[PDB]
């Protein structure tokens, strides 16, 4: 939770700061990552922007952005099966494809626009065979399965992946910021320290 805000400020503190930090930030310990921002916030000197630091952040941001869409493709699958969980507790209903095939009889086709071909050959033979199942198994056979454990686990899947979005999208916002204004002058570093000291004002 916190370390997303710490790691995003450390990475941009090598674009606009005095720290090189040749150890890998992904494998860096959290307690190392907090001393880097204290060096920037205390003293602001030796503005040595290097290509070895800038090229590291472009691969770091693109790996974070790649990780963002992989969480969202997994956050979608948790949210998609959550609606099918929520459809279970409100119940099942008959699908009634035989009645549904009649709605296509009264609607426009626009490809096979002649209505005497598809209805006389396909949709009405499909409707009459489907209507037999509305009179054969019309007894409400009970549906069970005890899906209460899926509600518990997908609650834990939702509370983990959405917690990752509140961390990962914090890293995108700090690293991108303004793509119109990624300035490298002396004024951009001076206003950068004010954002850093605001985040470290809450250490307790």
């Amino acid at each position: 939770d916190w370390l997303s805000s710490a790691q995003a400020y450390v990475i941009k503190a090598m674009e606009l700061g005095l720290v090189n930090s040749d150890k890998d930030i992904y494998q860096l310990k959290p307690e190392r990552l907090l001393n880097v921002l204290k060096n920037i916030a205390t003293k602001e000197i030796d503005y040595s922007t290097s290509a070895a630091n800038i090229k590291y952040a472009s691969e770091q941001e693109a790996e974070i952005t790649k990780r963002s869409r992989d969480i969202s493709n997994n956050l979608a699958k948790v949210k998609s099966r959550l609606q099918n969980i929520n459809s279970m507790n409100r119940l099942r209903e008959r699908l009634s494809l035989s009645k549904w095939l009649l709605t296509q009889n009264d609607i426009n086709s626009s490809l096979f626009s002649e209505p005497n071909e598809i209805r006389s050959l396909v949709l009405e033979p499909l409707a009459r065979a489907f209507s037999n199942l509305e009179a054969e198994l019309e007894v409400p056979i009970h549906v069970q399965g005890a899906l209460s454990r899926e509600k518990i686990y997908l609650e834990g899947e939702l509370t983990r992946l959405a917690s990752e979005m509140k961390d990962v999208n914090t890293q995108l916002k700090i690293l991108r910021g303004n793509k119109r204004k990624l300035g490298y002058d002396a004024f951009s570093v001076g206003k950068f320290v004010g954002e850093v000291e605001k985040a470290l004002s809450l250490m307790g």
């Binding site: 963002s68 869409r69 969202s72 493709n73 956050l75 979608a76 699958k77 979005m165």
Partner: protein, 333 residues
């Protein structure tokens, strides 16, 4: 090869600047008789350069374009041959005219400075194979060759060479051109004509309508590359999502209609407000206020990426459904 308006004057200078490494090729000094005035006029102009230290770091190259003395200046690379040529020029004939004597008496000032001037000298003429020579030199000499379109690259670098040649010739300094500035200009020309004409041609496809509607706004190429990668990433996300069945294959209709609603809302918001700006400027403002919007919007009632909204906006503009320029339907389609 290139547009052949440039003569051998620029061709040989660009070829000799190509085969260099941070060494300034100083003083082309176009000359068009062993006792001619313009020769010692040119060699007298390089006196104060090597006498000073702001130009020569003992790495410069001096040469001439278009006589026994010319072979004496050209065919001596070492110091002893330079000394022999200096004694031969010092004793060939008596001083004929003051217009050459006023340069010759200071040309005979220092033996070592004159010897280093001869050791860097190489007089050349060139011929009609100079565009072919420049083409072959760029083909077999440039690291990381760009052989698919080199005529226009040579056109821009010859335009730069001719521009610096005219700027040096009109004023009263010799042709001081460094290989560092030439390398930076050739690298900029190479990068501009590799990032756009081929690279950006691969990752947007014959000028599709979304990239042309971007071109009507004439916005910078960073937004062009961002639009191309957003459209490609959005198409690949659709492919991934319908391979694994994540989203049903008609929710793009509900996504695109809402986008029509937001585009109409932003068009009334930004086109009725100003009504006095250029069409490209109000199109740019409409495009940026559309891009910072339509990001909270939901596809198949769930959260979607920024890249998906940008790519579906660009693919929606590709079928001429929405636009950025106020006059776009009359221009294309």
């Amino acid at each position: 090869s290139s547009w052949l308006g440039y003569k051998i004057q620029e061709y040989r200078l660009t070829q000799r600047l190509l085969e260099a490494n941070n060494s300034s090729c100083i003083g082309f000094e176009i000359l068009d008789s062993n006792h001619s005035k313009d020769l010692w006029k040119t060699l007298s102009n390089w006196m104060d350069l090597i006498d000073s230290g702001e130009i020569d770091v003992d790495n410069t190259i001096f040469l001439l374009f278009t006589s026994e003395v010319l072979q004496l200046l050209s065919t001596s690379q070492a110091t002893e041959e330079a000394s022999k040529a200096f004694d031969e020029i010092l004793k060939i004939v008596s001083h004929p005219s003051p217009s050459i004597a006023n340069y010759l008496n200071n040309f005979s000032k220092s033996k070592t400075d004159a010897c280093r001037l001869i050791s860097k000298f190489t007089y050349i003429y060139g011929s009609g194979s100079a565009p072919h020579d420049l083409r072959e030199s760029y083909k077999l000499h440039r690291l990381g060759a760009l052989e698919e379109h080199l005529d226009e690259i040579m056109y821009e670098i010859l335009g730069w060479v001719s521009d610096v040649l005219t700027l040096a010739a009109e004023k009263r300094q010799p042709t001081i051109v460094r290989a560092k500035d030439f390398g930076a200009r050739l690298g900029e020309i190479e990068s501009k004509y590799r990032q756009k004409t081929i690279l950006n041609y691969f990752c947007n496809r014959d000028a599709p309508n979304y990239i042309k509607q971007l071109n009507l706004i004439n916005v910078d190429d960073s937004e062009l590359e961002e639009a191309a990668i957003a459209n490609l990433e959005t198409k690949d996300a659709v492919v991934e999502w319908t391979l694994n069945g994540d989203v049903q294959d008609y929710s793009y209709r509900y996504y695109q209609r809402e986008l029509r609603r937001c585009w109409g809302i932003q068009k009334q918001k930004i086109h009725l407000d100003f009504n006095g700006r250029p069409e490209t400027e109000v199109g740019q403002r409409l495009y940026i206020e559309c891009l910072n919007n339509v990001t909270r919007y939901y596809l198949e009632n769930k959260k979607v990426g920024d890249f998906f909204a940008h790519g579906t906006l660009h693919s929606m503009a590709d079928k001429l459904t929405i636009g950025w320029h106020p006059e776009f339907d009359k221009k294309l389609g």
